[PDB]
Amino acid sequence: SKLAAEQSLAQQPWVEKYRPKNLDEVTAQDHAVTVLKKTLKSANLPHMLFYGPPGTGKTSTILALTKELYGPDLMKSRILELNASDERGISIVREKVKNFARLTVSKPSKHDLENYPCPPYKIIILDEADSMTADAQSALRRTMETYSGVTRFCLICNYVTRIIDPLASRCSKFRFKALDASNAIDRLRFISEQENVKCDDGVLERILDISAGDLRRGITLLQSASKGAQYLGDGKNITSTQVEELAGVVPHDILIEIVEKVKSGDFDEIKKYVNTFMKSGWSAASVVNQLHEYYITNDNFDTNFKNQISWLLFTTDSRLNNGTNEHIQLLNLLVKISQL
Amino acid sequence: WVDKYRPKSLNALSHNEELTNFLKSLSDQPRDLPHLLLYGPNGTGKKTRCMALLESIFGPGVYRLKIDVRQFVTASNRKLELNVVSSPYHLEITPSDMGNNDRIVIQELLKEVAQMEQVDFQHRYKCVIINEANSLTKDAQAALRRTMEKYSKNIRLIMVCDSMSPIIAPIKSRCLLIRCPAPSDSEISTILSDVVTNERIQLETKDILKRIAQASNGNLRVSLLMLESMALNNELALKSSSPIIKPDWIIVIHKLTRKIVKERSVNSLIECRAVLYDLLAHCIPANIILKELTFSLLDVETLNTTNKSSIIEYSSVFDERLSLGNKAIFHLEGFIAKVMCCL
Amino acid sequence: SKENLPWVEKYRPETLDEVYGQNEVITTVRKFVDEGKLPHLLFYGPPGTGKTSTIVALAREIYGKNYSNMVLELNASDDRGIDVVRNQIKDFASTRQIFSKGFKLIILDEADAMTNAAQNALRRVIERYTKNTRFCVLANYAHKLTPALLSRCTRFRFQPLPQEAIERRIANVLVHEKLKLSPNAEKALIELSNGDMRRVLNVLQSCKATLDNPDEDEISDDVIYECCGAPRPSDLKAVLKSILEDDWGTAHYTLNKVRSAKGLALIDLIEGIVKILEDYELQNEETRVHLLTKLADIEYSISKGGNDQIQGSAVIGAIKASFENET
Amino acid sequence: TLSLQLPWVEKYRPQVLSDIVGNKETIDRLQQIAKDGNMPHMIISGMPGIGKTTSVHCLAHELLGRSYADGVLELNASDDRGIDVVRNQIKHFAQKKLHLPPGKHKIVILDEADSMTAGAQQALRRTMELYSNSTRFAFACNQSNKIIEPLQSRCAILRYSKLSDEDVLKRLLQIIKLEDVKYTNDGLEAIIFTAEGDMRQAINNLQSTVAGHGLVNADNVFKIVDSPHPLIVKKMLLASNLEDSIQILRTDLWKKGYSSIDIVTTSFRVTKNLAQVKESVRLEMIKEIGLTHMRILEGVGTYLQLASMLAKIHKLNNK
Amino acid sequence: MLEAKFEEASLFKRIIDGFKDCVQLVNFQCKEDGIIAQAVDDSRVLLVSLEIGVEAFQEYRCDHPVTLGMDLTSLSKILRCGNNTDTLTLIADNTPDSIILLFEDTKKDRIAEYSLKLMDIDADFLKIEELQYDSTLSLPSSEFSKIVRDLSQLSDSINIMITKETIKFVADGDIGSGSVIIKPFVDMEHPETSIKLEMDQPVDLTFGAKYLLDIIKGSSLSDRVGIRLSSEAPALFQFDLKSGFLQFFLAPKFN
Amino acid sequence: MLEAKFEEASLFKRIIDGFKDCVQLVNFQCKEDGIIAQAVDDSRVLLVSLEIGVEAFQEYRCDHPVTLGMDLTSLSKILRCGTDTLTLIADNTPDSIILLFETKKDRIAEYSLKLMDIDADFLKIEELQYDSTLSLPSSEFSKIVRDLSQLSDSINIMITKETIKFVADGDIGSGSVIIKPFVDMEHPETSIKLEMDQPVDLTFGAKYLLDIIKGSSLSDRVGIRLSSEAPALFQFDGFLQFFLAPKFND
DNA sequence: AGACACTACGAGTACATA
DNA sequence: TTTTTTTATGTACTCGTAGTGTCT
Ligand SMILES: Nc1ncnc2c1ncn2[C@@H]1O[C@H](COP(=O)(O)OP(=O)(O)OP(O)(O)=S)[C@@H](O)[C@H]1O
Numbered sequence A: 001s002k003l004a005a006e007q008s009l010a011q012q013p014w015v016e017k018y019r020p021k022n023l024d025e026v027t028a029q030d031h032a033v034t035v036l037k038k039t040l041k042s043a044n045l046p047h048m049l050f051y052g053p054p055g056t057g058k059t060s061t062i063l064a065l066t067k068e069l070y071g072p073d074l075m076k077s078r079i080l081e082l083n084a085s086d087e088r089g090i091s092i093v094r095e096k097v098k099n100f101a102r103l104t105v106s107k108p109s110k111h112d113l114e115n116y117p118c119p120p121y122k123i124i125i126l127d128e129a130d131s132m133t134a135d136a137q138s139a140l141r142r143t144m145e146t147y148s149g150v151t152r153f154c155l156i157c158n159y160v161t162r163i164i165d166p167l168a169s170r171c172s173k174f175r176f177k178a179l180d181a182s183n184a185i186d187r188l189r190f191i192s193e194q195e196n197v198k199c200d201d202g203v204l205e206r207i208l209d210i211s212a213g214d215l216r217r218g219i220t221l222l223q224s225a226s227k228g229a230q231y232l233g234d235g236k237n238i239t240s241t242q243v244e245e246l247a248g249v250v251p252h253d254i255l256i257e258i259v260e261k262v263k264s265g266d267f268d269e270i271k272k273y274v275n276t277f278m279k280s281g282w283s284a285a286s287v288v289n290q291l292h293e294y295y296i297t298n299d300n301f302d303t304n305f306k307n308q309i310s311w312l313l314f315t316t317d318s319r320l321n322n323g324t325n326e327h328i329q330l331l332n333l334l335v336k337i338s339q340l
Numbered sequence B: 001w002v003d004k005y006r007p008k009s010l011n012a013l014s015h016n017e018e019l020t021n022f023l024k025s026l027s028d029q030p031r032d033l034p035h036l037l038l039y040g041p042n043g044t045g046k047k048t049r050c051m052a053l054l055e056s057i058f059g060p061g062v063y064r065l066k067i068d069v070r071q072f073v074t075a076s077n078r079k080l081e082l083n084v085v086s087s088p089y090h091l092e093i094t095p096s097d098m099g100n101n102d103r104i105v106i107q108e109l110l111k112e113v114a115q116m117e118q119v120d121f122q123h124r125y126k127c128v129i130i131n132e133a134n135s136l137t138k139d140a141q142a143a144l145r146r147t148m149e150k151y152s153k154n155i156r157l158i159m160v161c162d163s164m165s166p167i168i169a170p171i172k173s174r175c176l177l178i179r180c181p182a183p184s185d186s187e188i189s190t191i192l193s194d195v196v197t198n199e200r201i202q203l204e205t206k207d208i209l210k211r212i213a214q215a216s217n218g219n220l221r222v223s224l225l226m227l228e229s230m231a232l233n234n235e236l237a238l239k240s241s242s243p244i245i246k247p248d249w250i251i252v253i254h255k256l257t258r259k260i261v262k263e264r265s266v267n268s269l270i271e272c273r274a275v276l277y278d279l280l281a282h283c284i285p286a287n288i289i290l291k292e293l294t295f296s297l298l299d300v301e302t303l304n305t306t307n308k309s310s311i312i313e314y315s316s317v318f319d320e321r322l323s324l325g326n327k328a329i330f331h332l333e334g335f336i337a338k339v340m341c342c343l
Numbered sequence C: 001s002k003e004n005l006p007w008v009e010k011y012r013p014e015t016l017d018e019v020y021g022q023n024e025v026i027t028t029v030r031k032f033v034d035e036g037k038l039p040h041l042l043f044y045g046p047p048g049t050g051k052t053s054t055i056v057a058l059a060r061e062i063y064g065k066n067y068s069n070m071v072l073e074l075n076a077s078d079d080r081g082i083d084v085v086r087n088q089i090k091d092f093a094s095t096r097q098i099f100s101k102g103f104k105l106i107i108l109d110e111a112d113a114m115t116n117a118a119q120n121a122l123r124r125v126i127e128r129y130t131k132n133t134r135f136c137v138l139a140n141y142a143h144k145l146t147p148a149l150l151s152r153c154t155r156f157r158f159q160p161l162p163q164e165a166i167e168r169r170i171a172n173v174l175v176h177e178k179l180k181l182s183p184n185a186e187k188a189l190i191e192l193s194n195g196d197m198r199r200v201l202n203v204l205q206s207c208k209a210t211l212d213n214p215d216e217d218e219i220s221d222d223v224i225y226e227c228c229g230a231p232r233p234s235d236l237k238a239v240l241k242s243i244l245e246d247d248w249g250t251a252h253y254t255l256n257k258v259r260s261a262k263g264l265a266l267i268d269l270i271e272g273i274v275k276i277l278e279d280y281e282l283q284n285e286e287t288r289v290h291l292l293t294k295l296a297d298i299e300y301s302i303s304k305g306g307n308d309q310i311q312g313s314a315v316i317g318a319i320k321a322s323f324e325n326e327t
Numbered sequence D: 001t002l003s004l005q006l007p008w009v010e011k012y013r014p015q016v017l018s019d020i021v022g023n024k025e026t027i028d029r030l031q032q033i034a035k036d037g038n039m040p041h042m043i044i045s046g047m048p049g050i051g052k053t054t055s056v057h058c059l060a061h062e063l064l065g066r067s068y069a070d071g072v073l074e075l076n077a078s079d080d081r082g083i084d085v086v087r088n089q090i091k092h093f094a095q096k097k098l099h100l101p102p103g104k105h106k107i108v109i110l111d112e113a114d115s116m117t118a119g120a121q122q123a124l125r126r127t128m129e130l131y132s133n134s135t136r137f138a139f140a141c142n143q144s145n146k147i148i149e150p151l152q153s154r155c156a157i158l159r160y161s162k163l164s165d166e167d168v169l170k171r172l173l174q175i176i177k178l179e180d181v182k183y184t185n186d187g188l189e190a191i192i193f194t195a196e197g198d199m200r201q202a203i204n205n206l207q208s209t210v211a212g213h214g215l216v217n218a219d220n221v222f223k224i225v226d227s228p229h230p231l232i233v234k235k236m237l238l239a240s241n242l243e244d245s246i247q248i249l250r251t252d253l254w255k256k257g258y259s260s261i262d263i264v265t266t267s268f269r270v271t272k273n274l275a276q277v278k279e280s281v282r283l284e285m286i287k288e289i290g291l292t293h294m295r296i297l298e299g300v301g302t303y304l305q306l307a308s309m310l311a312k313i314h315k316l317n318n319k
Numbered sequence E: 001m002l003e004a005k006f007e008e009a010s011l012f013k014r015i016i017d018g019f020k021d022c023v024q025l026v027n028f029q030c031k032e033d034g035i036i037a038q039a040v041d042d043s044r045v046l047l048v049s050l051e052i053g054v055e056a057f058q059e060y061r062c063d064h065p066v067t068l069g070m071d072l073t074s075l076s077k078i079l080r081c082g083n084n085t086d087t088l089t090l091i092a093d094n095t096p097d098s099i100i101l102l103f104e105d106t107k108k109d110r111i112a113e114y115s116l117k118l119m120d121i122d123a124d125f126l127k128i129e130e131l132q133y134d135s136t137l138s139l140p141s142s143e144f145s146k147i148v149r150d151l152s153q154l155s156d157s158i159n160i161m162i163t164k165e166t167i168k169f170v171a172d173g174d175i176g177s178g179s180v181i182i183k184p185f186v187d188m189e190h191p192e193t194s195i196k197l198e199m200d201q202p203v204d205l206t207f208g209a210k211y212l213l214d215i216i217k218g219s220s221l222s223d224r225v226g227i228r229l230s231s232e233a234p235a236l237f238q239f240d241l242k243s244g245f246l247q248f249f250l251a252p253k254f255n
Numbered sequence F: 001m002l003e004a005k006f007e008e009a010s011l012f013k014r015i016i017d018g019f020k021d022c023v024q025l026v027n028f029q030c031k032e033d034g035i036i037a038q039a040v041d042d043s044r045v046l047l048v049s050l051e052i053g054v055e056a057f058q059e060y061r062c063d064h065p066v067t068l069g070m071d072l073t074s075l076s077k078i079l080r081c082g083t084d085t086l087t088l089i090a091d092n093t094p095d096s097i098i099l100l101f102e103t104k105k106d107r108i109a110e111y112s113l114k115l116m117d118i119d120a121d122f123l124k125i126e127e128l129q130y131d132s133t134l135s136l137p138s139s140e141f142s143k144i145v146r147d148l149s150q151l152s153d154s155i156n157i158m159i160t161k162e163t164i165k166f167v168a169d170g171d172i173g174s175g176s177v178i179i180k181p182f183v184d185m186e187h188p189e190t191s192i193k194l195e196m197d198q199p200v201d202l203t204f205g206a207k208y209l210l211d212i213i214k215g216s217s218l219s220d221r222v223g224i225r226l227s228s229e230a231p232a233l234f235q236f237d238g239f240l241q242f243f244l245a246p247k248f249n250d
Numbered sequence G: 001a002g003a004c005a006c007t008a009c010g011a012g013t014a015c016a017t018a
Numbered sequence H: 001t002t003t004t005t006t007t008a009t010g011t012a013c014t015c016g017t018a019g020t021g022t023c024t
């Protein structure tokens, strides 16, 4: 029962092993969980709309809230979790969601009311609401507006623009902030201490730096570095280079080579070096990010050059965000920034 | 042949020793393994390394696999039938064999295998190899986003792809990212020496092997296949000046580039459209066609930097157009017309 | 109990006297229902303006507490096809009332999601049965309704709620709840609403929960801004000044520290800078063209994700290159 | 509040062809036809709210007298009008025997004929051709292109046009005289301006203004009825300076609650129906408006997108 | 708590069959006097009102007035899984929750315990049929069903006319026109075939055929349909059960 | 050359339609004793078995035991396109299967089928120990299954303290049928046999049982054998066995 | 008691879309 | 002067096995 779940958690990846179970385990998203804790004593939970970057803890926050609200017994009877792996057309929204909202709340047991608040409403959460069509979303309007006495709606998405304006107006918007080094270093150090991850001084802060506001990717990189350090068995500490080599980050010397090829050189040698660089598999997104960081943070270029480099990097990132060919886009970017 | 000589374990790999050691690190503790995404150039050997890693996570029976047929029903009376490569320890799914109906197959089959528990009389989870994750539309990726996290104790995904550009950010975050850099010409020539020593090839000079590497651009699948092809024309004895056998579509693209750089007119644009139709009708993707045509146009020495810059700019623009469109010829002809107008 | 409903639902108007903002429409509707001449209504307006509340309070005033039975209320949540029209709406219009004597009311809420065939079948139901029943169509977009159906109803445009109405409703809530609000905090609340009562009520509930006290203190602008995660005008103008005057590295560092110390979003900063630069009196409109185009492009790119640092640098460079022409 | 009164559109609905202030030519044609008899198959097309349904109803009534109940078959878009209905009920009505005066015929009125399926329209051909001596068909639609050419070939085509300001003003004056309502010239002018050739909309706005304010004045009319949507959009697009168009979009459209989708759709329609600028300029403007609409539909609909669209339109107009 | 053990199984089955495809969402109310339920049609045209006292039940125990709402589709699905020889038992806990339908066999230990999850319907329980009626009549079920489903083929509307000792059902349509005139008469050797009629004022009002075709479905319960008509009053079609009554309130058409 | 004669074609028709929804290809092995068949589902979640001995055939001649691999498409078409005496004919190297329909009529028709070669892997069948073994009439179990399948999509079997419980927790509600062992004298068909050693509780898919209960007409009683970690055993007396694997845990 | 006209709920096939 | 194209909900038509009230 409990011991089996503990062992299964202990034999699961660190992303799911250290998933926040309570509203206190969340470190940086304090503004939303403060309201979620204060409404836990009351009974006026409004319709909520979680939105933000991926890996900020929206699903974890709503799961911890539903747990702290209903207990592990009513957690399976007073919830309706609809993810993107299910059909969510107009038909589903009209039949299943509306029938569950029209249902009466399940009666709590004697042990439930003794330890948990047991609010008089249930929760219908809709994870990954970006994939929901606009008509199926508009169908939810009166469904959530008339049955608010017995059910509460929780939408979860990454792009708040994909949800129609009436639905965004009906729900209170909770924006989850990116988990950078400052507000997630405590959680990363806790995860490293619980797993005896022997690292150096500036490793963890570097990991989140590569994460760019993503604690899931940081925990995964930490687990990978820990596995790579335990396989060796040398007993030393993990370094920033050993972390950045498996995170897909281009080394500094290879980036300096690219900068030298762009500064001095014509189309031919630039194209040849790009063809040689694309042989070693690097994600063009990370290369564009490193080039942007280098060009903007360097105090050696003119403001007129910096505006143009920023616009060109923006255009290249926007074109890469559509699944384009990495080689063509990278070559075009380097050529355009080579021409002054 | 590329099939007769292929590594079956991690200790049988002959290049990227750092990647082999990282795979051994990742397979040391096999049950505490997150989802993986192998990305890199096409033909590096990531599909072989994934199977070699599974051979370390499980017994040697991972390679004894069978192809079964599975059927699905869409929202209408249309039926889909696709072949699944399954093994007593893992299964392989390639949703690149259909259109926009990959999300249904993904969700249904993955929920089925997640609820399904492994059988005995052959560890605890059953691996899924998603081949060519780039063809997965955003809807199927969004559907898999929550399936990756809900069932993490029975289903571990190993997604093989060539470029993480079409992969969404949530899926990228939900799995480890492993890059497979293409092997250098030295390792390719070393593998070629071994395979020609085993296949009894007669070489007057060894440098030709290096040239094969310089003709494959790091691709081992192209290098070995081209070596075996040019070994059939020279009758199992490669000469010091044996010609390099290029695929038919590459020669067609080169002739199209020649036609572009020689004549720039609408009458030539009609012939260009005809050649593009003949290329597309014979199972050749349009993104590869555009990439190779642009790279061949840049290699033309008659043009200058001003022409090549505009060529690569229009190439990127029409690459975005083709990634946002479906009628590939509608973008290919536009790119060709813009290139003709540039020159 | 009503004490469990959210503030948006708990404070739903039950009578026509609790619907603020709309005075020209409410008075004319009251006169319609008093003199008896009630035509087919078409309430067109943005979300959260009070159309559904208005029509519900109107049906309550017309039929009494028996509203839920003498009125046929259909919405997008219910199946509304051509056969649904043909059967349900025609049978409701053709027969008489079961509980009292009087005309019937068909409230087609959110009728902008109906099929064209359904509207084509309903446009002759409205014209044929017009002596014993009425039709009220609620809409947010007037382009989804056929012109034939659009010409049969009297159109009432629900304007966005002005300052006075939202302030009156906020005062009513502050009387109903043990809560105090600062004047500047109230002004900032009015500013981030765009005439949406739902947003105001939701963020008011959120800031009351944020207080973390027995509500013996006042809600200031800091509480509001930390609740909705919106940037403050101070940081907004500081970032704009650093972009317009300081160097590239200084502006980049300022934007980074401002957006990372408070956890602000780049889209909110973009919207705020757009709102601030709208009052800027500039030279030849080429700078305004470049600014608007580049900012809209960056917003559309943000609406799909990507690198936030690259987009911030793009915003800085776009603003700088746009103001470089105003010389 | 126990009972309501009939609206002025239904109460003052014309019951004779003389009370119709529409197209004088077609109205006099229908009057002469009803006076002499021998009404042929007809298809009446036009815009909503100009007197098409009332016209055919008055025609059938004055042509059939007391036999209207048993000689007229009325079928609207609200009733089933598939192939099965045309096969069974319409054919049974056309074959039904009825002793009529020696100058009349049974009339089959089909309201909203542009919504009938292709199968029903095809089956109606021989149904109307084999019984053309005792059954006549009158279609009332808004788009003649939705009715197949074989059906149009067997009937007359009456295209109703927009009602000029004179006709709507005369009808409004008649309604005022029959209602004894205090009005003003500027109020009636504003009503005609906001009606846009729609008689039904004009009468509805007049009744609304009367029952809401009592006096028909331009102030009250503009207070209860906003300015026409396409005209403000046209004035915004035809602005000479970017600042003027931005101010118009901000104050008139955005500050009054008009959604971005409605704004971009009205801009597209106005640019399509525009005639002041050349064809190429209109094509580029439509291209930019569609580029903006593609972002509005994806949920990125804000004021910044419309401002950028106006800026791009002005840049195009900047030679 | 609530314990309602029926004597048989097919009784409730026929009770729900009476208005199976007529209404959707019902809200039963169990009190000390019996179960009472009123349900409005989807188009808000007719109201079904059923009342079964403590006579039709084998055992009845109700502590406090309980309200259980449910959809008729799920209730029919649950009731179809029960054998006609079983014994039905409705059970409800202290607070209103999923009603327990228990099927208990009389010879073998077969405990079929289904749990039907309730709905949350707005309990707008009104007080109806407390108004004086202008005309009352009663006639056999088979005759009414025959007349209804014979006139429904000629038209979609049926005009009922009650004149001085004269009942008239008229159906005016497109392919034809029918009229049935039954006269009040009371028989002594067959007291169930009598057609009683007490009229105070002449009544003339029309109804739809699609609704009468569903009202006549309740003729499987009783054999004497009572019809109460009046100007501006819901037409009362009452079937008299052995313990309670099932009454349909139909709304007349607008002439 | 194999010659088999069923007195009635209806028996073979019912046999083939009993499982014509769970498989597409099927191997029939033919030996001296009778005919035996096993087939694996396309999803490899359920296996179907079949054994018909010389008791059912009016005439049987089988010189050499051979494996006939037939598809469901053509055989189903032949069985559905056409009580009468059915005769199965095969020759040396049986490239075709002939099905003659022949007591008061002399009309005959048949369409030939070309066979395939499927690698029917041989997995041993062991009679291990079981924590619970029960037998109940086929019609009652079929009724229970098609009654509980309307509520949920997963049927829970709970065998404890001489009581069996078929539970189904669905969306619209929850059903639970509790049954006690019963043996009847006047009707030997309506008897409930059960023996246990450990209370067991497993969950199976309802879509699989919805097709398993299609074999309710082959025999009158069905056996359920449930254990801790081994898959459930559904036994039908011709002897045929179904191995159903349950859901892991939650 | 049973056969077969009447019938109404369900799977399949297309056909548009401003 | 001529052939084809992925998908998504609403609409209309058709055959059609099926469930039940009725007549030789
Ligand atoms: N605020 C947080 N505190 C602690 N751990 C976190 C936090 N956010 C994310 N994590 C970790 O990241 C894992 C993933 O959390 P999720 O809630 O699924 O992320 P997400 O916001 O849902 O991203 P998506 O699903 O792609 S939009 C959790 O199981 C934690 O291990």
Ligand SMILES: Nc1ncnc2c1ncn2[C@@H]1O[C@H](COP(=O)(O)OP(=O)(O)OP(O)(O)=S)[C@@H](O)[C@H]1O
Binding pocket: A166, A169, C007, C008, C009, C011, C012, C013, C018, C019, C020, C021, C022, C046, C047, C048, C049, C050, C051, C052, C053, C054, C139, C140, C161, C169, C197, C198, C201
């Ligand atoms: N004029 C108003 N006066 C007071 N409260 C209002 C007003 N308008 C909106 N509200 C509040 O906002 C809630 C929602 O109002 P609704 O009428 O449902 O919005 P809406 O105008 O119908 O727009 P939709 O539903 O998104 S199309 C009400 O329950 C009130 O709490």
Ligand SMILES: Nc1ncnc2c1ncn2[C@@H]1O[C@H](COP(=O)(O)OP(=O)(O)OP(O)(O)=S)[C@@H](O)[C@H]1O
Binding pocket: C148, C151, D008, D009, D010, D012, D013, D014, D019, D020, D021, D022, D047, D048, D049, D050, D051, D052, D053, D054, D055, D141, D142, D171, D199, D200, D203
């Ligand atoms: N020429 C007219 N003279 C007087 N009243 C008119 C005239 N045209 C329209 N009306 C009024 O408008 C009402 C409705 O007119 P209709 O004939 O129904 O409009 P229409 O021309 O048929 O266009 P539709 O029905 O929307 S396709 C009538 O009842 C009259 O009150």
Ligand SMILES: Nc1ncnc2c1ncn2[C@@H]1O[C@H](COP(=O)(O)OP(=O)(O)O)[C@@H](O)[C@H]1O
Binding pocket: B001, B002, B003, B005, B006, B007, B012, B013, B014, B015, B041, B042, B043, B044, B045, B046, B047, B048, B049, B191, B220, B221
């Ligand atoms: N380490 C290696 N040593 C020798 N050959 C290899 C190695 N890795 C891959 N190959 C060759 O690559 C071929 C398969 O390429 P594949 O993995 O399908 O390309 P991709 O990486 O695009 O999937 C095999 O035939 C095998 O011989």
Ligand SMILES: [Mg+2]
Binding pocket: A058, A059, A060, A127, A156
């Ligand atoms: Mg999530």
Ligand SMILES: [Mg+2]
Binding pocket: C051, C052, C109, C110, C138
């Ligand atoms: Mg509303």
Ligand SMILES: [Mg+2]
Binding pocket: D052, D053, D111, D112, D140
């Ligand atoms: Mg009309």
